[PDB]
Design an enzyme around this catalytic site. Structure first.
Site, PDB file in Angstrom:
ATOM      1  N   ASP C  52      -0.100 -11.659  18.006  1.00  0.00           N
ATOM      2  CA  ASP C  52       0.048 -12.253  19.336  1.00  0.00           C
ATOM      3  C   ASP C  52       0.350 -13.745  19.283  1.00  0.00           C
ATOM      4  O   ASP C  52      -0.289 -14.493  18.542  1.00  0.00           O
ATOM      5  CB  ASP C  52      -1.222 -12.046  20.164  1.00  0.00           C
ATOM      6  CG  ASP C  52      -1.564 -10.595  20.373  1.00  0.00           C
ATOM      7  OD1 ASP C  52      -1.674  -9.856  19.391  1.00  0.00           O
ATOM      8  OD2 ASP C  52      -1.759 -10.188  21.525  1.00  0.00           O
ATOM      9  N   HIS C  54       1.499 -15.391  22.539  1.00  0.00           N
ATOM     10  CA  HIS C  54       1.017 -15.705  23.894  1.00  0.00           C
ATOM     11  C   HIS C  54       1.619 -16.950  24.551  1.00  0.00           C
ATOM     12  O   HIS C  54       0.921 -17.712  25.215  1.00  0.00           O
ATOM     13  CB  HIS C  54      -0.519 -15.756  23.923  1.00  0.00           C
ATOM     14  CG  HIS C  54      -1.174 -14.416  23.781  1.00  0.00           C
ATOM     15  ND1 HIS C  54      -0.931 -13.370  24.648  1.00  0.00           N
ATOM     16  CD2 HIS C  54      -2.075 -13.954  22.881  1.00  0.00           C
ATOM     17  CE1 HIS C  54      -1.648 -12.322  24.285  1.00  0.00           C
ATOM     18  NE2 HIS C  54      -2.350 -12.650  23.215  1.00  0.00           N
ATOM     19  N   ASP C  80       3.580  -9.770  22.554  1.00  0.00           N
ATOM     20  CA  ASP C  80       2.839 -10.776  23.319  1.00  0.00           C
ATOM     21  C   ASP C  80       3.363 -12.189  23.062  1.00  0.00           C
ATOM     22  O   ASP C  80       2.674 -13.054  22.512  1.00  0.00           O
ATOM     23  CB  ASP C  80       1.324 -10.632  23.128  1.00  0.00           C
ATOM     24  CG  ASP C  80       0.760  -9.414  23.858  1.00  0.00           C
ATOM     25  OD1 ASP C  80       1.530  -8.499  24.222  1.00  0.00           O
ATOM     26  OD2 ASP C  80      -0.462  -9.357  24.084  1.00  0.00           O
ATOM     27  N   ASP C  83       2.375 -15.308  27.975  1.00  0.00           N
ATOM     28  CA  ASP C  83       1.031 -15.215  28.547  1.00  0.00           C
ATOM     29  C   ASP C  83       0.966 -16.144  29.747  1.00  0.00           C
ATOM     30  O   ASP C  83       1.657 -15.905  30.731  1.00  0.00           O
ATOM     31  CB  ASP C  83      -0.057 -15.527  27.517  1.00  0.00           C
ATOM     32  CG  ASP C  83      -1.470 -15.422  28.089  1.00  0.00           C
ATOM     33  OD1 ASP C  83      -2.294 -16.313  27.789  1.00  0.00           O
ATOM     34  OD2 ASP C  83      -1.770 -14.470  28.839  1.00  0.00           O
ATOM     35  N   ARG C  84       0.170 -17.207  29.672  1.00  0.00           N
ATOM     36  CA  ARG C  84       0.033 -18.126  30.807  1.00  0.00           C
ATOM     37  C   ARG C  84       1.329 -18.923  31.057  1.00  0.00           C
ATOM     38  O   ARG C  84       2.216 -18.974  30.198  1.00  0.00           O
ATOM     39  CB  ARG C  84      -1.182 -19.051  30.623  1.00  0.00           C
ATOM     40  CG  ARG C  84      -2.473 -18.352  30.173  1.00  0.00           C
ATOM     41  CD  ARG C  84      -3.109 -17.515  31.278  1.00  0.00           C
ATOM     42  NE  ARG C  84      -3.440 -16.164  30.812  1.00  0.00           N
ATOM     43  CZ  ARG C  84      -4.672 -15.713  30.562  1.00  0.00           C
ATOM     44  NH1 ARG C  84      -5.735 -16.499  30.736  1.00  0.00           N
ATOM     45  NH2 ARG C  84      -4.844 -14.459  30.143  1.00  0.00           N
ATOM     46  N   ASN C 112       1.922  -5.359  25.161  1.00  0.00           N
ATOM     47  CA  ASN C 112       1.469  -5.067  26.514  1.00  0.00           C
ATOM     48  C   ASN C 112       1.809  -6.177  27.527  1.00  0.00           C
ATOM     49  O   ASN C 112       1.827  -5.938  28.739  1.00  0.00           O
ATOM     50  CB  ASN C 112      -0.035  -4.760  26.507  1.00  0.00           C
ATOM     51  CG  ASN C 112      -0.896  -5.995  26.233  1.00  0.00           C
ATOM     52  OD1 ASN C 112      -1.883  -6.234  26.935  1.00  0.00           O
ATOM     53  ND2 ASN C 112      -0.526  -6.785  25.222  1.00  0.00           N
ATOM     54  N   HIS C 113       2.080  -7.381  27.026  1.00  0.00           N
ATOM     55  CA  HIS C 113       2.455  -8.515  27.879  1.00  0.00           C
ATOM     56  C   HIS C 113       3.913  -8.498  28.303  1.00  0.00           C
ATOM     57  O   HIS C 113       4.267  -9.041  29.346  1.00  0.00           O
ATOM     58  CB  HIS C 113       2.143  -9.831  27.179  1.00  0.00           C
ATOM     59  CG  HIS C 113       0.717 -10.258  27.316  1.00  0.00           C
ATOM     60  ND1 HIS C 113       0.350 -11.573  27.494  1.00  0.00           N
ATOM     61  CD2 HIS C 113      -0.431  -9.541  27.321  1.00  0.00           C
ATOM     62  CE1 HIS C 113      -0.964 -11.651  27.591  1.00  0.00           C
ATOM     63  NE2 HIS C 113      -1.462 -10.432  27.488  1.00  0.00           N
ATOM     64  N   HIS C 162       1.838  -3.278  18.316  1.00  0.00           N
ATOM     65  CA  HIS C 162       0.929  -4.190  18.984  1.00  0.00           C
ATOM     66  C   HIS C 162      -0.508  -3.672  19.078  1.00  0.00           C
ATOM     67  O   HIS C 162      -1.430  -4.321  18.582  1.00  0.00           O
ATOM     68  CB  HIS C 162       1.436  -4.583  20.365  1.00  0.00           C
ATOM     69  CG  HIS C 162       0.663  -5.706  20.970  1.00  0.00           C
ATOM     70  ND1 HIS C 162      -0.122  -5.549  22.092  1.00  0.00           N
ATOM     71  CD2 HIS C 162       0.514  -6.995  20.582  1.00  0.00           C
ATOM     72  CE1 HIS C 162      -0.700  -6.702  22.382  1.00  0.00           C
ATOM     73  NE2 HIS C 162      -0.336  -7.594  21.476  1.00  0.00           N
ATOM     74  N   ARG C 209     -10.738  -1.462  28.266  1.00  0.00           N
ATOM     75  CA  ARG C 209      -9.682  -2.410  28.629  1.00  0.00           C
ATOM     76  C   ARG C 209      -8.955  -2.020  29.928  1.00  0.00           C
ATOM     77  O   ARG C 209      -8.327  -2.866  30.571  1.00  0.00           O
ATOM     78  CB  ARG C 209      -8.678  -2.504  27.475  1.00  0.00           C
ATOM     79  CG  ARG C 209      -8.188  -3.890  27.151  1.00  0.00           C
ATOM     80  CD  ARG C 209      -7.167  -3.853  26.012  1.00  0.00           C
ATOM     81  NE  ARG C 209      -7.711  -4.315  24.731  1.00  0.00           N
ATOM     82  CZ  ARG C 209      -7.607  -5.563  24.265  1.00  0.00           C
ATOM     83  NH1 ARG C 209      -6.981  -6.512  24.957  1.00  0.00           N
ATOM     84  NH2 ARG C 209      -8.138  -5.870  23.092  1.00  0.00           N
ATOM     85  N   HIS C 236      -3.051  -7.625  19.269  1.00  0.00           N
ATOM     86  CA  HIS C 236      -3.678  -7.197  20.525  1.00  0.00           C
ATOM     87  C   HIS C 236      -5.141  -7.657  20.745  1.00  0.00           C
ATOM     88  O   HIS C 236      -5.559  -7.881  21.888  1.00  0.00           O
ATOM     89  CB  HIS C 236      -3.526  -5.663  20.670  1.00  0.00           C
ATOM     90  CG  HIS C 236      -3.907  -5.128  22.014  1.00  0.00           C
ATOM     91  ND1 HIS C 236      -3.360  -5.600  23.189  1.00  0.00           N
ATOM     92  CD2 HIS C 236      -4.764  -4.140  22.365  1.00  0.00           C
ATOM     93  CE1 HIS C 236      -3.873  -4.933  24.207  1.00  0.00           C
ATOM     94  NE2 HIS C 236      -4.724  -4.038  23.735  1.00  0.00           N
TER      95      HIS C 236
END
Lengths: 228, 294, 294
Positions: C52, C54, C80, C83-84, C112-113, C162, C209, C236
């Site tokens: 990840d 992110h 991933d 993210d933010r 998953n992102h 992932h 989750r 992950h």
């Protein structure tokens, strides 16, 4: 003026990375303070350990300080303590260290002379060419890229070029296109006789490589070298 | 159209004033109920609110899964008459939740999911952690996270002593809640705001919530680590990822609980988006096979 | 076009976004390349496996200072990338630009992102809005994410993805048979590969989750043995060390975002696989709205 070494030392072995790094970029002035025998044992040991500090940024701070240090010790005391330090960085786990160590050799050849390099440095650099790990095999090519700049025509041709041209048949494509990238870089530092009968045929072979990248960079090298 | 109120009996099937005894005396609690089968969803409102905050949610969720709803007016809130309405510690309020359960059933506690908003979020946890609900199978915390709540203490102190002191009418209270941005859903404001204020004299706040400042540290402190330590399926609903603190971020990235973000909401997310809060809890329930769909 | 790509890379290296127009073209050609790629993308060593990232652009720069520059070093990313909403655009745009420039030099899997679902809600969509004015760039990247391969196989021995294993997938051919060209489902085989976690209780478990499955060592050993695999490498899960062995070395978790979300204090890690598939791990540090919860 004989006590601030204790202070300087304390901070060079401190927990916080911040004190260590900045006080390192302070050693040059303290070397010129009174450093003929002082740097020998009162301060070099601390430098030696900092060469293998776990925080790579601190290793960087030593590598960049090396040429100024190797200067004040001189050629005859370099093959001693510091040669192994300089070579071992080339094979460090962190690329940015291997890369800084590469450009460090150049600064060393700038101080000690191309002759000194042909003896001491170049062979240890030629070793990594056979290294099982491709990340190391490429470090060889990055050093030859750097060394060609300050070694001149004769030394580069003799003791470096054969190693590069022999790496054209590396099983790993990342090494093969760094070969084409090297010849592009070093080519100008070679007489036209070497470029045509020794180099060009090899670049011609590389354009017929199985890999997308090796082709491309073999072409661009031929273009940049007016060979086409 | 109107800012005029809507009675609870539009959303809840019934109510009860539950009797509870302790040391000094006896207390009456007030719960709003709905549904006849499936697991009980025990709902705990935010500070200065009432069970009525869950009104719309209830309507939305009942039409999704076969569950029961027990929306509890916490002490000093709504219509809960307590011999001691000054003590609002985390422990006392959680003790209360447990006692309402025993008093309502005791002998036969049915499957229960705890769902807490803000203050009621912290209490839900303190109740779950102390294992005061002997049938509790899940836990949901709405829009409360320790690190950020602790960081907000002074600013929500400011909000409260900035609020209007009184309201000319219940209509104005409803109007003010939407206009100020406390509640973004007019349908929900029209039913919930009557549990926020009482009247005699103009309408005033049911609870001088600024007084409760002394208990706020005890509410949110260690709440993240506490929430994480409850070994039951957990749900956390936020209006934004900005709510997360260090401990729940580590926790959620390690896949220890479930998080949904609903950035279309303000702080009262169950009031602002009852549709989607119902949907999230519904999915949660069906997925763990705690409930059945319609 | 090759030299326009070099220009874009040089620029992204200075943390300077590409124009909306340029992102569009990048994504068009990326789709075209990734179409030729498999659900189980064959990768040949030496490669560096990365977990990840992110959207932490600067720590990705740090990653490159550790492992080395692309295309010199071969990389395999396990998802991933976003993210933010701080520097997620530059992070993803760079990695995509590298892929378009160098097909054989990097592999970028789906996490998953990389979904319309999470990106809308976590920050990426907001960043696209603030940096472009519209949100077409969110659309160009999320349409692209549909094309990312799900898994990868390093020299037919080390399996990369992932999340983890699925009760709907026994063999690699099961993964190959999937239609991956869509938004990540909430249920089923594709979701699981992106969402599942390794677990210390043998067998399958409902994922706390929200999506996917917890899976035990018994499952890892079964899966590996049947597919002739020596290792399952996945991301992950935040791990305080950057990397972690579990399931008796059948699984390794690699998390490549140091001090995740600028507050966690975790180390990051990448796994170098040499010319003969010898693993070595390199750990690194980071590079140097209602305000009322009552």
């Amino acid at each position: 003026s004989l006590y601030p070494i204790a202070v300087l030392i304390d901070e060079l072995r401190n927990e916080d990375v911040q004190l260590r790094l900045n006080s390192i970029k302070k050693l040059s002035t303290i070397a010129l303070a009174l450093g003929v025998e002082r740097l020998s044992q009162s301060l070099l040991p601390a430098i030696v350990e900092l060469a293998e500090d776990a925080k790579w940024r601190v290793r960087l701070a030593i590598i960049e300080y090396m040429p100024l240090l190797a200067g004040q010790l001189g050629v005859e005391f370099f093959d001693e303590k510091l040669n192994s330090l300089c070579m071992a960085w080339l094979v460090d786990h962190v690329y940015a260290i291997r890369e800084a160590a590469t450009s460090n050799l150049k600064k060393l050849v700038e101080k000690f002379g191309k002759e000194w390099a042909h003896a001491t440095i170049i062979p240890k650099v030629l070793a990594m060419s056979g290294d099982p790990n491709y990340l190391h095999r490429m470090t060889t090519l990055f050093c030859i890229n750097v060394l060609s700049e300050v070694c001149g025509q004769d030394i580069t041709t003799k003791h470096m070029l054969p190693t590069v041209l022999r790496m054209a048949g590396d099983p790993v494509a990342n090494v093969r296109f760094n070969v084409a990238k090297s010849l592009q870089k070093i080519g100008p530092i070679l007489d036209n006789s070497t470029l045509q009968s020794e180099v060009k045929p090899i670049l011609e072979k590389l354009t017929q490589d199985q890999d997308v990248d090796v082709k491309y960079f073999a072409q661009e090298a031929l273009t940049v070298l007016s060979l086409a | 159209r109107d800012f005029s109120p809507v009675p609870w009996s539009q959303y809840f099937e019934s109510m009860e004033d539950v009797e509870v005894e302790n040391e000094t005396g006896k207390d009456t609690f007030r719960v709003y109920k709905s549904g006849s089968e499936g697991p009980v969803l025990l709902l705990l409102h935010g500070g200065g609110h009432s069970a009525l905050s869950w009104a719309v949610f209830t309507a939305a969720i009942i039409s999704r899964v076969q569950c029961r709803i027990v929306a509890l007016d916490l002490r000093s809130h709504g219509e809960t008459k307590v011999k001691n309405p000054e003590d609002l510690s985390a422990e006392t309020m959680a003790k209360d939740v447990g006692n309402v359960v025993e008093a309502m059933y005791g002998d036969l506690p049915p499957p229960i999911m705890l769902i807490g908003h803000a203050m009621g979020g912290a209490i839900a946890v303190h109740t779950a952690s102390s294992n005061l609900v002997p049938s509790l199978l899940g836990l949901c915390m709405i829009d409360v996270v320790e690190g950020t709540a602790m960081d907000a203490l002074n600013s929500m102190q400011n909000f409260l002593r900035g609020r209007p002191k009184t309201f000319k009418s219940l209509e104005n209270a409803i109007e003010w809640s939407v206009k100020s941005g406390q509640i973004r859903n007019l349908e929900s404001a029209r039913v919930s705001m009557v549990g926020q204020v009482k009247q005699c004299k103009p309408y005033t706040w049911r609870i001088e919530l600024a007084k409760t400042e002394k208990y706020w540290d005890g509410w949110f402190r260690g709440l993240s680590n506490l929430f994480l330590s409850c070994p039951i399926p957990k749900l956390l609903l936020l209006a934004g990822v900005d709510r997360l603190d260090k401990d729940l971020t580590i926790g959620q990235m390690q896949g220890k609980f479930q998080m949904q973000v609903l950035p279309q909401c303000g702080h009262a997310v169950h009031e602002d988006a009852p549709d989607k809060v119902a949907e999230a809890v519904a999915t949660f329930l069906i997925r763990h096979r705690f409930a059945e769909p319609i | 076009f090759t030299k326009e790509l070099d220009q874009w890379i040089e620029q992204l290296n200075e943390c300077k976004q590409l124009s909306e127009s340029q992102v569009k073209s990048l994504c068009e050609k990326a789709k075209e390349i990734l179409t030729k790629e498999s659900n189980v993308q064959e990768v040949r060593c030496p490669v560096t496996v990365c977990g990840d990232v992110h959207g932490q652009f600067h720590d990705l720069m740090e990653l490159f200072r550790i492992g080395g520059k692309s295309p010199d070093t071969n990389y395999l990313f396990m998802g991933d990338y976003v993210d933010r909403g701080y520097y997620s655009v530059e992070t993803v745009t760079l990695l995509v630009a590298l892929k378009v420039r160098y097909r054989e030099r990097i592999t970028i899997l789906r996490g998953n992102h990389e979904s319309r679902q999470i990106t809308q809600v976590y920050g990426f969509y907001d960043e696209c809005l603030r940096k472009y004015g519209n949100a077409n760039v969110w659309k160009y990247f999320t349409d692209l994410f549909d094309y990312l391969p799900l898994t990868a196989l390093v020299d037919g021995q080390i399996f990369c993805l992932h999340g983890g294993l699925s009760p709907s997938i026994d063999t690699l051919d099961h993964i190959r048979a999937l239609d991956r060209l869509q938004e990540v489902p909430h249920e089923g085989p594709m979701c699981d590969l992106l969402w599942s976690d390794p677990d210390d209780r043998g067998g399958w478990g409902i994922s706390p989750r929200g999506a996917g499955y917890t899976f035990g060592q018994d499952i890892s050993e079964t899966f590996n043995h049947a597919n002739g695999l020596t290792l399952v490498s996945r991301a992950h899960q935040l791990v305080m060390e950057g990397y972690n062995w579990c399931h008796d070395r059948n699984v390794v978790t690699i998390f490549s975002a140091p001090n995740y979300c600028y507050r966690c204090g975790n180390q990051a890690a990448i796994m170098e696989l040499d010319d003969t598939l010898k693993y070595s791990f390199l750990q690194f540090d980071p590079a140097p709205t209602p305000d009322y919860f009552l």
